[PDB]
Amino acid sequence: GPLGSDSKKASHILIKVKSKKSDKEGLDDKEAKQKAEEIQKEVSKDPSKFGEIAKKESMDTGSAKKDGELGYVLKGQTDKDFEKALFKLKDGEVSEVVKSSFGYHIIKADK
């Protein structure tokens, strides 16, 4: 019979959570959650705008300057919450606000 793949192509956003009010690197946990929710509802209704929105709104400059693209993600490379939220997606589909050790993430599977 058929068999499923060990990897898939993806895009993502990082929203940094900080415990300090004075740090410019990220936001307070309620402001990070609000930012993550308002970009989620904007990238989920149009995943072709994901690359324009991630490049402005993501704090991970290592992927945001590449339009939020990760390329092919292998199992075990990312957080267990990130992997669970990615591997359930169809081609071109968008996840949700995913919480991890850095704060909040938003994830898209690619075509």
User: The tokens of 87 are what?
Assistant: 């591997």
Domain CATH number, residue 79 = 3.10.50.40
Burial class (CB in 10 A: 0-12, 13-18, 19+), 16: middle
How far is it, in rounded angstroms, from Cα 107 to Cα 95?
Answer: 5
- One DSSP character per residue, 17-53 reads B-S-SS-SSSB-HHHHHHHHHHHHHHHHS-TTSHHHH
Total domains in the chain come to 1
Q: Are 27 and 21 in contact (CB under 8 A)?
A: no
Backbone angles phi and psi of 74, in degrees to 5: -90, 145
Q: What angle do CA 69, 92, 32 make, to 5 degrees?
A: 55
> Which residues are CB-contacts of 41 (< 8 A; sequence separation ≥ 6)?
none
Number of helices (H), then strands (E), in the chain: 4, 4
Burial class (CB in 10 A: 0-12, 13-18, 19+), 13: buried
Helix axes 50-57, 29-44, angle to 10 degrees: 160
Nearest to 8 by CA among 75, 72, 95: 72
Nearest-Å Rg of the Cα atoms of the chain is 14
Q: Are 43 and 37 in contact (CB under 8 A)?
A: no
For 99, the domain range is 1-111
